[PDB]
Each structure stands twice: as C-alpha cells, then as structure tokens.
Amino acid sequence: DIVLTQSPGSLTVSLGQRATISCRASESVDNFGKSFMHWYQQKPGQSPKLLIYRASNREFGIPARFNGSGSGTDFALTINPVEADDVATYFCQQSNEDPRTFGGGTKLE
Amino acid sequence: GLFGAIAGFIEGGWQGMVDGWYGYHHSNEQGSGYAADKESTQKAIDGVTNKVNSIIDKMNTQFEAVGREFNNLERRIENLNKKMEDGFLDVWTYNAELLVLMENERTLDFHDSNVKNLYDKVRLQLRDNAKELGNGCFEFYHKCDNECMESVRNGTYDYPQYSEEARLKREEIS
Amino acid sequence: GLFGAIAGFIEGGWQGMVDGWYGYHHSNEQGSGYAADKESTQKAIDGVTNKVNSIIDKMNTQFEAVGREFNNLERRIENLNKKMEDGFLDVWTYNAELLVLMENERTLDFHDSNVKNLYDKVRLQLRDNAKELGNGCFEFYHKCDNECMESVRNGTYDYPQYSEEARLKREEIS
Amino acid sequence: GLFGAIAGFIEGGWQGMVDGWYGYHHSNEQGSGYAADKESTQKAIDGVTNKVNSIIDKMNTQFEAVGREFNNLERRIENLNKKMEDGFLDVWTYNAELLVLMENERTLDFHDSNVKNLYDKVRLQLRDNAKELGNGCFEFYHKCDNECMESVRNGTYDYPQYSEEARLKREEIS
Amino acid sequence: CNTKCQTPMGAINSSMPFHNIHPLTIGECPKYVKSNRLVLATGLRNSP
Amino acid sequence: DQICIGYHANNSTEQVDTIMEKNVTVTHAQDILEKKHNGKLCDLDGVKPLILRDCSVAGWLLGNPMCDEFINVPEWSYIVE
Numbered sequence: 151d152i153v154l155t156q157s158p159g160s161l162t163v164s165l166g167q168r169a170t171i172s173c174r175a176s177e178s179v180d181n182f183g184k185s186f187m188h189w190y191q192q193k194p195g196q197s198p199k200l201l202i203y204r205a206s207n208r209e210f211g212i213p214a215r216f217n218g219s220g221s222g223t224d225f226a227l228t229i230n231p232v233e234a235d236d237v238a239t240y241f242c243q244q245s246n247e248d249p250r251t252f253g254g255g256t257k258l259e
Numbered sequence: 260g261l262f263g264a265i266a267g268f269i270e271g272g273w274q275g276m277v278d279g280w281y282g283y284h285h286s287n288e289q290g291s292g293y294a295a296d297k298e299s300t301q302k303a304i305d306g307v308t309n310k311v312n313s314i315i316d317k318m319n320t321q322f323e324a325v326g327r328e329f330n331n332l333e334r335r336i337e338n339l340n341k342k343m344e345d346g347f348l349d350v351w352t353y354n355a356e357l358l359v360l361m362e363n364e365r366t367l368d369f370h371d372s373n374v375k376n377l378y379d380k381v382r383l384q385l386r387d388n389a390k391e392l393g394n395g396c397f398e399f400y401h402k403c404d405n406e407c408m409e410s411v412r413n414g415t416y417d418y419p420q421y422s423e424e425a426r427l428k429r430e431e432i433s
Numbered sequence: 434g435l436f437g438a439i440a441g442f443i444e445g446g447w448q449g450m451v452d453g454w455y456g457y458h459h460s461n462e463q464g465s466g467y468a469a470d471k472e473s474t475q476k477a478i479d480g481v482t483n484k485v486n487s488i489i490d491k492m493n494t495q496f497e498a499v500g501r502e503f504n505n506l507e508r509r510i511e512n513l514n515k516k517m518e519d520g521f522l523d524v525w526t527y528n529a530e531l532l533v534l535m536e537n538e539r540t541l542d543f544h545d546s547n548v549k550n551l552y553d554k555v556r557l558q559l560r561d562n563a564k565e566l567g568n569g570c571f572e573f574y575h576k577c578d579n580e581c582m583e584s585v586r587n588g589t590y591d592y593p594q595y596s597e598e599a600r601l602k603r604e605e606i607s
Numbered sequence: 608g609l610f611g612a613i614a615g616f617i618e619g620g621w622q623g624m625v626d627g628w629y630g631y632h633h634s635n636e637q638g639s640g641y642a643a644d645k646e647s648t649q650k651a652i653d654g655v656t657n658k659v660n661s662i663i664d665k666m667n668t669q670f671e672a673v674g675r676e677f678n679n680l681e682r683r684i685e686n687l688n689k690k691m692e693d694g695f696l697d698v699w700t701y702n703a704e705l706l707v708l709m710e711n712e713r714t715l716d717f718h719d720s721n722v723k724n725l726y727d728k729v730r731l732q733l734r735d736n737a738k739e740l741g742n743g744c745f746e747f748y749h750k751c752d753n754e755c756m757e758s759v760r761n762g763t764y765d766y767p768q769y770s771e772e773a774r775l776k777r778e779e780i781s
Numbered sequence: 782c783n784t785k786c787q788t789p790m791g792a793i794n795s796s797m798p799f800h801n802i803h804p805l806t807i808g809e810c811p812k813y814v815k816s817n818r819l820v821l822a823t824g825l826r827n828s829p
Numbered sequence: 830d831q832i833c834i835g836y837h838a839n840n841s842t843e844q845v846d847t848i849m850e851k852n853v854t855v856t857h858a859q860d861i862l863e864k865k866h867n868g869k870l871c872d873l874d875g876v877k878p879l880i881l882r883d884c885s886v887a888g889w890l891l892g893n894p895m896c897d898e899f900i901n902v903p904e905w906s907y908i909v910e
C-alpha cells in the first residue's frame with residue numbers, strides 16, 4: 151500500500167518561471183525496469199486528464215512544456231514556461247500493485 | 260548398471276532410508292535401524308546439482324527465431340528463410356535431446372560408483388573380521404557395542420585390537 | 434577396456450562358444466564343454482539392439498537440401514544459400530560421426546561390465562570353496578556331479594552343505 | 608573418480624615419481640625407491656595423444672564466416688545473413704565446449720582404470736602371499752631379493768615355489 | 782494479465798529452460814525445442 | 830550380529846529416459862519443459878501491446894476510415910495483427 155505525499159501543498163509562480171512539483175513514495179514504485187508513476191492534472195470544474203504516463207513519457211496533445219523526471223521513490227514534474235492557462239490541481243499516481251493511490255493534490259497559484 | 264552396485268550385489272533397496280541416499284543397516288545386540296553417512300550423499304547432491312545447472316548454463320546461448328515477411332514475388336528467399344529457421348531448431352532440439360539422454364546415463368552410473376565404493380571401503384576395513392554373504396551383508400566376529408558400528412560409519416576402523424578377538428574366533432570355528 | 438574384463442583377467446576368447454556371448458567352461462569328471470547362460474546374453478542383445486535403433490530413431494529429423502537458382506545478378510544471395518546448405522551438412526555430419534564414435538565406446542565398455550559382473554557373481558557364490566587362478570578359472574573342492582555346474586549356471590549355489598566337505602578339504606591340504 | 612583408484616584406496620600421490628605415470632614403490636632389505644612399468648604408461652600416452660589429435664582432426668571442417676554487404680534497402684536479407692552467421696557460430700561453439708567437457712571426463716576416468724587395473728593384477732599375482740593394508744600396500748612373506756620385486760614388475764610371478772615358504776609363514780603367525 | 786514472455790498461442794509463467802509452444806517468442810524466457818519430454822534424472826533407479 | 834550396505838529407495842513411479850533403455854524408474858526426477866500456457870495475450874513488462882484487430886500495418890499507417898481507434902496510439906510493446 152504505497153501512500154503518496156506531495157509537496158509543496160500549494161505552489162505559486164508567476165508567468166515564465168520554472169514550476170517544480172514533486173511527490174515521494176513509501177517503497178519503490180519501480181519494477182520490471184520502468185517506474186510506474188503517472189501524473190494527472192485536473193482543471194477547476196473539469197475532469198482530470200492524463201499528462202505523464204510511466205513518469206517519463208508524455209501523452210500526445212499535451213504541450214512539450216510539461217517535463218517529468220524521476221527514479222526510485224522521488225519524482226518531479228517541471229513546466230516551462232507557465233502561462234495563465236495552467237492553474238489546476240496535479241496528482242501523482244502509483245500502479246505497482248493494487249489498490250491504486252493518489253497524491254494529496256497541489257494547487258498551482 | 261555397469262559397476263553392478265545397483266542390483267548385482269545389492270538388488271533390494273531400503274524404503275526405510277529417507278534421511279539420505281547411501282547408508283548402513285546395523286543389526287546388533289543394541290537394537291537395529293538405519294543410519295546415514297554424510298560424506299557420501301553430500302558429494303552426490305553437489306555433483307548432481309552442478310550437472311543440473313550445467314545443462315541450463317550451457318544452453319543459455321541458442322538460436323532465437325524472428326519473424327520475416329516477403330511480398331509473394333520473392334519465394335526463393337522465403338523458402339531460404341523458412342528452411343534456415345526450422346533447420347536451426349532441428350539442430351538445437353537434437354543437441355538438447357542428446358545431452359539429456361547422455362547425462363541421464365551419467366547420473367545412474369555415477370550413483371553406481373558411489374554405493375559401490377562405499378561397499379569397497381567397508382570390505383577393505385573389515386577384511387578378515389567379517390564374512391561376505393553376497394547381498395552386501397558383513398558378519399563380523401567381535402562382540403562390541405553400537406559405537407563400533409559408528410566407528411565403521413566414520414571410516415575409522417582400527418584393526419589390531421579387534422584382530423586378536425576375531426582370530427580367537429577364527430580358531431574356534433575351525 | 435576400463436573395467437578390465439576383456440583382456441586383463443581373461444585375455445583369451447573362446448572360438449568354440451557360438452551359442453551365445455557369455456558362458457561358462459566346465460572341466461570335470463563328466464567330460465568337458467562349453468555352455469551358455471541366457472540371462473546375460475539376452476540383456477546384451479536387447480540393449481545393443483535398442484542402441485542401434487536409437488541412432489536411427491534420433492537421426493530421423495535432419496536437414497534436407499533443396500535446389501534454388503539465381504539469375505547471375507544476385508550472387509550475394511546465391512553465396513548465402515550455398516554457405517547455408519553445406520554449413521548445415523557440415524554440422525549434421527559431425528553429429529553423426531561423433532554419435533557413432535561415442536556409442537562404439539559405449540558398446541565395448543558395456544560388454545566389459547556384463548562379463549565382469551558375470552565373473553563377480555561366480556566368485557561371490559563359490560567364495561572359499563574354489564581358488565582364483567588369475568585367468569578367470571575357479572578350482573572348487575567338492576567332488577559333485579555335472580549338475581553342480583548347472584547349479585552354478587542358474588545362479589543357485591547353496592553354500593552350507595558344500596562348506597563341510599570343502600572345509601574338510603581346507604584342512605587336509607593345510 | 609568412478610572406479611575409485613584415484614583417492615579411494617590410494618589417496619596420496621607420489622611426487623618422487625617423475626619417470627612415468629604409473630609405477631611401484633618397493634621397501635625391502637635392499638633399500639627403497641620408486642620404479643616404473645612401461646607397458647601401462649605407454650598405452651596411456653598413446654591413448655591420450657590419439658584423443659588430443661582426434662579433437663583437432665574432427666574439428667577440421669567447420670563453418671567459416673564470410674563478409675556480405677547490403678545497400679540499406681534490403682534489411683530482411685541483412686538480418687537473415689546476420690542471424691545465420693552468428694547462429695552457426697553458436698552451434699559450433701557449443702559442440703567444441705561440449706566435446707572438451709566430455710573428453711576431460713574420459714581422460715580422468717581412463718586414468719582411473721589403468722591404475723586400478725594395475726592394482727588388480729598385483730593383488731591377483733600376490734594373492735595369499737601378501738596382505739592388503741588398505742592404501743594399496745602389499746606385505747608379502749617370503750624373504751627374497753630385489754629381483755622378486757622386478758618379477759612383480761614384469762608381471763611374471765610364479766606362485767608355487769613362493770607358496771611353501773609363505774604357507775610356513777601362514778602357520779607360524781597362526 | 783502481465784507476463785515476462787509472450788507467444789502467439791499464449792504466455793509462459795516459468796523458470797524452466799525449455800518449452801515447446803512456439804518459436805516466435807518475445808521477451809527473456811525459455812528457449813524453444815520441438816520435444817515432447819525432457820527430464821533430468823537426479824536419483825537412483827529403484828527396484829520397487 | 831550383522832552390518833550391511835544399502836541405498837535410498839522410494840515407492841515413486843517417476844519415469845526418466847536414457848539411450849540404453851527408454852523406460853527406467855528413478856527415486857527423484859526433474860522435468861525441464863513447459864507445455865502449458867495461460868492462453869491469453871497480455872502486455873510485456875507493463876507496456877500494453879498494439880493489438881491491431883482487423884486492419885493491418887498498411888491500413889493503420891495510412892489511416893483506414895474503418896479503424897480510427899488506432900490514431901494517436903501510445904507506446905507499445907509489440908504489434909499483434
């Protein structure tokens with residue numbers, strides 16, 4: 151049962167400055183050679199959508215500004231640049247074994 | 260059984276021997292039972308386990324078939340690829356079967372020697388003291404305790420002391 | 434001869450033995466001659482015949498060369514086909530020669546054990562009654578009939594009765 | 608050691624024996640030393656040398672890789688050529704390793720029989736005259752010269768004469 | 782499901798070094814030999 | 830009193846093969862051959878394969894109007910057609 155702790159709880163960056171979001175896991179979410187942690191974004195009043203799958207690969211249709219890197223227990227997501235159309239709540243999900251667990255969320259101010 | 264230890268001299272196995280592979284049966288005044296010697300069965304376990312790994316280790320590198328496709332106008336190449344892929348499989352399946360067939364004979368013959376040599380050293384230790392019956396049985400003369408059976412079991416059989424009582428027993432039956 | 438039965442103890446074969454492979458020569462008061470025991474030569478016949486079939490049975494699946502032709506503008510493929518076809522033949526002709534070479538050694542060594550173990554059981558039955566000369570000959574003491582020779586031949590040698598007359602013959606020569 | 612001659616009966620080699628492979632150690636009134644018998648070590652030399660050549664002779668015909676090139680538009684053929692060339696090397700490197708692995712076992716086991724059979728004939732010649740200690744040692748009774756040791760060495764041990772003095776020595780210790 | 786080796790007829794869960802399902806396999810898994818039975822003897826022949 | 834030599838024996842009926850005779854019974858036999866499969870077709874190392882149902886490589890790459898579910902396909906392990 152991996153529990154996800156995500157810090158900072160609320161992130162505040164103006165337009166154009168790198169925004170780093172991170173979350174850590176209890177044990178390693180890396181198995182079979184690839185780390186299984188997916189990054190989700192939920193805009194206000196909207197259903198969440200997939201941003202990064204397997205912590206490295208980026209979904210088609212997601213702008214290349216979203217970068218995710220990580221290995222082992224710590225993973226980070228960076229956005230370059232940041233505009234007004236980026237405020238949302240971001241979650242990191244593990245899928246090493248059931249049940250799946252989500253992060254505590256992070257408002258991007 | 261080339262060495263003849265299995266069947267031959269001893270044609271009957273011991274179902275009561277579950278502790279190990281090779282052992283000794285003692286029938287003396289202090290009861291009877293089955294006991295094992297570790298130095299013989301441990302080497303057989305190590306030798307067989309090494310053989311089992313060796314089959315797996317040697318077979319690590321083998322032909323791996325891969326898919327190739329052709330456009331119905333090049334059938335000589337497709338036939339060449341088809342005959343090459345199954346030809347390699349035929350070669351490799353013969354090596355695996357031949358290796359298994361030969362190593363099965365090795366293990367059975369290897370077990371023959373270990374029990375045969377186990378018998379040889381007991382005869383070589385007891386010598387004149389005991390008589391050879393024919394089914395692997397030794398009937399010694401001295402009226403010693405069960406520790407002497409263990410002495411036979413640790414391969415430490417001192418001869419001289421036991422010779423005098425036994426030679427007094429070679430002259431009373433003669 | 435690893436087991437040493439061929440040559441070694443018995444370095445001279447019997448040309449008069451045509452009935453079977455392994456047998457006994459008896460030289461007693463009731464004439465002399467050669468006789469055979471079926472339980473030894475039958476197992477050798479079955480074992481060798483099974484081996485002969487096994488070489489044929491295992492070699493059933495083999496590479497079969499087929500003809501392919503090319504149009505003088507594709508010589509890399511023709512060279513590839515030529516090197517593949519004769520390469521498989523070279524691999525398969527090595528397996529056949531190696532298999533024949535090893536199984537020839539098996540049959541000669543398998544025959545060594547059978548005659549060696551045949552000698553071992555006769556020594557194990559006669560024991561003190563006869564003397565070991567060196568060329569496989571046993572010279573027993575009791576003055577029994579030719580049926581006792583057959584008793585040695587069916588592997589049913591009862592010891593006790595013959596021991597008393599023989600031990601009376603171990604004390605008159607001593 | 609299936610035959611058990613190496614270790615088993617004789618667990619200690621002779622560093623002073625450099626003349627040959629198999630020999631006899633004599634410890635009598637006329638000094639002591641090591642001596643060799645040629646008929647045993649010569650056959651081992653010839654047999655092993657024939658085996659060493661046989662590995663080289665049989666491996667004469669082998670796959671020989673040759674260079675072929677393709678024009679970046681025919682990669683199925685290039686992959687076919689690449690998988691065929693290294694596939695044949697994988698097959699041939701397994702045969703060479705398996706052949707070396709098996710023939711190493713043959714030589715060690717072949718040497719076991721030669722020294723084992725060398726022991727067997729000496730026991731078969733001395734018989735009642737000497738006693739078997741356990742480490743290959745024979746302690747005979749007659750007080751003959753060093754020539755009798757050579758007589759054991761040329762395999763010409765006449766029994767009868769030495770029996771009378773030895774049987775006078777079997778009755779004084781009994 | 783999730784299997785370390787996959788074949789056109791299914792998938793393999795094992796650590797054995799041989800299989801006879803299909804030659805065109807993907808992933809690190811036992812090699813293919815066209816044999817029905819392959820057993821290694823690790824014991825004595827028993828009279829009973 | 831008597832002491833003898835012996836070997837392990839078992840009531841098992843495991844069958845092993847050898848060149849001299851095809852049928853020999855041993856106390857312990859180890860089998861190395863896999864003849865059973867789950868019968869399914871799932872992913873390898875956690876990445877789902879690209880399972881082409883009815884259209885093929887030519888149809889998918891060209892964008893056949895029958896199969897529009899294979900556009901913008903993510904990473905795959907292998908292609909099944």
Ligand SMILES: *[C@@H]1O[C@H](CO)[C@@H](O[C@@H]2O[C@H](CO)[C@@H](O[C@@H]3O[C@H](CO)[C@@H](O)[C@H](O)[C@@H]3O)[C@H](O)[C@H]2NC(C)=O)[C@H](O)[C@H]1NC(C)=O
Nearest residue numbers: 247782783784785786792793794795796797863865866867
């Ligand atoms: C097939 O793959 C599985 C992984 O998915 C391998 O792990 C084995 O999975 C089985 C099924 O859960 C385990 O059996 C269980 O064992 C526990 C005791 O540890 C027992 O309490 C349960 O009731 C259940 O029987 C098994 O232990 C586990 N590990 C091994 C070594 O088998 C499995 O090995 C793969 N192969 C096979 C043939 O299943």
Ligand SMILES: *[C@@H]1O[C@H](CO)[C@@H](O[C@@H]2O[C@H](CO)[C@@H](O)[C@H](O)[C@H]2NC(C)=O)[C@H](O)[C@H]1NC(C)=O
Nearest residue numbers: 483817818843844845846847850851852853854
């Ligand atoms: C040796 O073992 C094989 C393998 O089991 C035996 O072959 C089986 O024989 C039975 C009896 O007729 C058949 O029902 C099976 O279908 C056979 N199986 C196979 C794989 O062939 C064989 O009978 C045994 N004995 C001998 C002498 O070969």
Ligand SMILES: *[C@@H]1O[C@H](CO)[C@@H](O)[C@H](O)[C@H]1NC(C)=O
Nearest residue numbers: 208214216217218219226228
């Ligand atoms: C994301 O950033 C990492 C390091 O922070 C870098 O290694 C990687 O190349 C970047 N990825 C992309 C797609 O730019």
Ligand SMILES: *[C@@H]1O[C@H](CO)[C@@H](O)[C@H](O)[C@H]1NC(C)=O
Nearest residue numbers: 406409410411412413414415
């Ligand atoms: C077992 O054999 C060893 C051999 O050195 C010996 O030390 C030991 O005393 C033996 N066991 C008994 C109970 O005598």
Ligand SMILES: *[C@@H]1O[C@H](CO)[C@@H](O)[C@H](O)[C@H]1NC(C)=O
Nearest residue numbers: 580583584585586587588589
């Ligand atoms: C041959 O041996 C068998 C073994 O049971 C025995 O029944 C038979 O009597 C023997 N032959 C003769 C002539 O005694």
Ligand SMILES: *[C@@H]1O[C@H](CO)[C@@H](O)[C@H](O)[C@H]1NC(C)=O
Nearest residue numbers: 754757758759760761762763
């Ligand atoms: C060595 O053995 C041969 C065997 O024929 C014999 O002729 C010779 O005399 C022996 N050597 C000696 C010194 O007796």
Ligand SMILES: *[C@@H]1O[C@H](CO)[C@@H](O)[C@H](O)[C@H]1NC(C)=O
Nearest residue numbers: 273274275276838839840841
């Ligand atoms: C082996 O199985 C048979 C089956 O009937 C049984 O009779 C026998 O007692 C068993 N032997 C052991 C040692 O369990």
